[PDB]
């Protein structure tokens, strides 16, 4: 069957071990432990095709990020995640994305802009500067919580859906 390989990327705490887990594992992480390079694996059905993830969840401290480039080079997809209350993550997507250019060698390369923590009232990204950055980039922003699940399906199907546009 067909295997889509996932990367989510972006700065620290913004969320993305609480959504991959989220998605595969079906509980919310509360606690904050820094990945380093994690990979969970999930057969699944999405639109009607029997496929399956293979998503790497990435570092996003500095410090723990060590050969990070190597794990995304292999990515098919990557969802570009920043927290709607975190204003620094969000300026720090251009870089991300950069990187992800990088490590393809292309301009061309299916992604997903992610804005989490949509459940939480701090928010410093309006959702117009998010779909802006995303219309630039030529991709879908989707907004979710890993908390109530809102939006955290739908990320990873869209992106699954961009791979396949590629
Ligand atoms: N309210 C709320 N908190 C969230 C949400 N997603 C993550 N968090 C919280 O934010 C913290 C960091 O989440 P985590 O998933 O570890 O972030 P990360 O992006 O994987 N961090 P790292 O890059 O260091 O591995 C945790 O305390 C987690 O509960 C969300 O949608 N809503
Ligand atoms: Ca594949
Ligand atoms: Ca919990
Ligand atoms: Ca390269
Ligand atoms: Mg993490
Ligand atoms: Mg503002
Ligand atoms: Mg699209």
Redesign the pocket.
Same mark, same amino acid.
């Given at each position: 069957m067909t295997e889509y390989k996932l990367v !989510?990327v @972006? &700065?620290? @705490? !913004?969320? =993305?071990? &609480?959504? %991959?887990? *989220?998605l595969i594992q079906n509980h919310? !992480?509360?606690? /904050?432990?820094? +990945?380093?390079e994690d990979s969970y694996r999930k057969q699944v059905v999405i639109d009607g095709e029997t496929c399956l993830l293979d998503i790497l969840? %990435? &570092?996003? *401290?500095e410090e /723990?990020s060590a050969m990070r480039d190597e794990y995304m080079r292999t990515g098919e997809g990557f969802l570009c !995640?920043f &927290?709607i209350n975190n204003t620094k993550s969000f300026e720090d997507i251009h870089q991300y994305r950069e990187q992800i250019k990088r490590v393809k060698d292309s301009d061309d390369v299916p992604m997903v802009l992610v804005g989490? =923590?949509?459940?939480?009232a701090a928010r410093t990204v309006e959702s117009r500067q998010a779909q802006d950055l995303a219309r630039s980039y030529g991709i879908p922003y989707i907004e +979710?919580?890993? =908390? %109530?699940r *809102?939006g955290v399906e739908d990320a990873f199907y869209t992106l699954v859906r961009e791979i396949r546009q590629h």
């Amino acid at each position: 069957m067909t295997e889509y390989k996932l990367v !989510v990327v @972006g &700065a620290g @705490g !913004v969320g =993305k071990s &609480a959504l %991959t887990i *989220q998605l595969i594992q079906n509980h919310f !992480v509360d606690e /904050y432990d820094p +990945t380093i390079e994690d990979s969970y694996r999930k057969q699944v059905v999405i639109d009607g095709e029997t496929c399956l993830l293979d998503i790497l969840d %990435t &570092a996003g *401290q500095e410090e /723990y990020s060590a050969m990070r480039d190597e794990y995304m080079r292999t990515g098919e997809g990557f969802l570009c !995640v920043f &927290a709607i209350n975190n204003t620094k993550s969000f300026e720090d997507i251009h870089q991300y994305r950069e990187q992800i250019k990088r490590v393809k060698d292309s301009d061309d390369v299916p992604m997903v802009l992610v804005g989490n =923590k949509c459940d939480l009232a701090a928010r410093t990204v309006e959702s117009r500067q998010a779909q802006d950055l995303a219309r630039s980039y030529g991709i879908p922003y989707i907004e +979710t919580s890993a =908390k %109530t699940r *809102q939006g955290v399906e739908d990320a990873f199907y869209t992106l699954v859906r961009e791979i396949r546009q590629h």
